[model samples]
Target: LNDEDQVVVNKAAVMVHQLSKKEASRHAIMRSPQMVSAIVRTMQNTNDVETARCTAGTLHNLSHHREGLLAIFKSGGIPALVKMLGSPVDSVLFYAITTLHNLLLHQEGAKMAVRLAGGLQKMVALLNKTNVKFLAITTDCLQILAYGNQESKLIILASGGPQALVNIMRTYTYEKLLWTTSRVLKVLSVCSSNKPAIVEAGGMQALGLHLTDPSQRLVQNCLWTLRNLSDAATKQEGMEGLLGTLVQLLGSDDINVVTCAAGILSNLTCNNYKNKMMVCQVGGIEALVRTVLRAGDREDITEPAICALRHLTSRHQEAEMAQNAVRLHYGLPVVVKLLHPPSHWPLIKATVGLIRNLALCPANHAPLREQGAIPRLVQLLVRAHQDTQREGVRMEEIVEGCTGALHILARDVHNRIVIRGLNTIPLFVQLLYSPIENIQRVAAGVLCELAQDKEAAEAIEAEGATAPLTELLHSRNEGVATYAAAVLFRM
Candidate 1:
């Protein structure tokens, strides 16, 4: 307040700032509530820039110690530090930003505190500053803020964060800057609302440029960012180049990079025929299948790998090549192996969907059925049914997929007997009353295929399949009604 008080406060801040540098002194300084409160009060009310800078510097040093950080937080240091962001001195702002960064890195509640203090906008505005040190710490701060907080992500996006990040990526090739910028973009991309903004700012192109940057982390960050942008990427033309890079990254020695690349492929190939064809052409299938065969117990890799295969092998019009590519790659055995127990429901679901696609081509029927497709298919159905009742797991898709694959496999007469031998008729009959029309349709379809044999037809009729089938005959879904009628007629 007065000159003597100001000198005393400044001298105390300067002393504390110098003392906090030694880890031992941080404990002593933070032990006194009067000392901690005086430092915060000086920071919050100081009109003298030097006092503010010294106090901020003291807090920054104190933040490194856990007890000191908790003490500072309880003493209302976060808001005071946030207030210091409005200071024009670069050192003052630097200390303030770094201290907040340290606080947020350890304290989850500090993120909301920073946001509520209007600190996020101030920090985001720092992105436009030319100070490299400031930009780097600001990016780190934003990165921590955006990490699982959806509201922080929206606030960052609203503050023009993505474009600023993209500009950093474009202007700077420094590894740390590139790494942090890409990391922030990766976290920002998680919010669906941020994806288009990221893309419009040339995020895809900026990220794609570093796909082969020789740094594993940078490449992986870019891959993940692109993976999150795959939905928008799919709709954008000229993404074949990006797809080729992703396909190449699929072979990276880093399993995480491979996982991210495969995940991107999975998302890009979904219902996008050209992307599928491009992936198949770029040896994406070989890379994907190899990943699956070698993924062994890593469900993270196998799930996306199988999902990518499922997408590539969907849609009968263009699937033949991708399906054959999978078969030729010896992908069938591993795919069938994934259907065995000790697997999660999603992997099984994807695997069954792929099997259904592979079965679309009659050539795959022999290998698939001989590879124990019928038995595994039956086991999945049994497990899915049981799990649904006990665990409340949604297995409608798995149910439809298993029956679909079996329906295709049953097109072979020899396969029909194998399926019939599994005693799956009872399950198929039960599925006829499924609430899902696709399940009912596929179940009835499998029954119609099984009915070709008089023994299966007898079993089908014996299972009380007639009532549901009769009821399904009046169903609104044309496929369900048609399959029901066919199964009833065969019986």
Candidate 2:
């Protein structure tokens, strides 16, 4: 990321591919606004498509940037991106969409531009073919555009967008439709309702059928999308089919496959008491905790375990079931280790988040700290990204692990632990200088958590944590930005 050259971008993308979603989200590496703008400017002004594509791929790792969301309106980025939608250079087009996909929300200009350029026509043409690259971008764009407020969402639904996307999902082979269809539906979950008719029209059935696809990656993506959409959409006609398939997937040997499957199970199970008991019958709690123990130390195990844990922590019935599972074998001990690790990565991030969620219940608190988890959590807020990549070491996982550790440490300070992690105060202050927005938010969240104690306030200020957090409070992504500020004020 420091290099002002293409090599840096290439290296960054590879590292990002290795990161789990929580790590990616915490660090905010994929599709960052700054990186997107930088790449767009380079591509627009310069003749080097390699640099353009290189930067595009790098920016793909940081896709949640608010600045990038505004880039289409502020600059001529969309036209340039649309122009590359079908470029002979395969890399340029897909990479461009990866960056453009993030900005689909609040993009008044891109919607107008796509219409003017027959963008929908071009996309429909792409959907008709087996060009995975083209299909991926088209659905991804639709998904993002449909993922916002009611107005933008209505615009998407009215654009005949749903029909084109459903065609791809229902007509295509499960294999080809996997990534594209799922990406589209995942984004659509944001604006969806409980109408079974709408869910069927959205191709939710086709997506559910693929939950047990032989191909692991395909199944993982599909289930992740289904969980997000089904949890929000609320159609129950084929609910049993979806839940049964996901339950069966719980036993897969592939960690990624199991992770998504487990996550879906947790989400589905949480819908009601009947659903929660269904998860129990399927060995949901045991499998998820086993995942946590099995993957506590490795990269491959990170995402699956954390995803399952998140699902468990996010909902009430499932969360209670998960807590009972954790209490059985000292689950808090294993979980706390994730908070403070030798590295600061996303795997660690997911771990920290799960720990925080589990800690929401008072019973899980003392046990978590008793295992020497607090110091390690504090260690992350102060530690810098360690640059050395051990032989055979996955850099992406390391980032996740680090942030996960931070999440654990920030859960709640009752006064004693707060003063002891004094260094945590200043360490957070320096995170404002981080290059990634998600990482900044992660760090800010931890700082805000620590800032809660009256005594910790002086330490937080002395460390210089408030200014950057205040700035984020005014961010376009008001939810996350305001979260950081609210935590700060509670201090």
Using TM-score as the measure, which candidate wins?
A: 1
For residues 359-410, write the lDDT of model 2, one tens digit per residue.
6666666676677656665555344354422244344333434444454445
For candidate 1, the 10 contiguous residues with the lowest summed lDDT are 1-10
Q: What's the TM-score of each model vs. the native?
A: 0.76, 0.42
Count clashing residue pairs per candidate. Answer: 0, 31
Residue-by-residue lDDT tens digits, candidate 1, 351-439: 88889989987889899988888898888888777766685336867777888889889999989989988888888899887888888
What is the alpha-carbon lDDT for the whole of candidate 1?
Answer: 0.84
Per-candidate Cα RMSD to the true structure, in Å, reads 5.4, 21.8
Candidate 1: Cα lDDT at 402: 84
Q: lDDT of each model, Cα atoms only?
A: 0.84, 0.57
Off by over 4 Å in 2: 1-237, 241-245, 248-283, 291-302, 315-324, 337-346, 380-411, 414-422, 432-449, 464-491
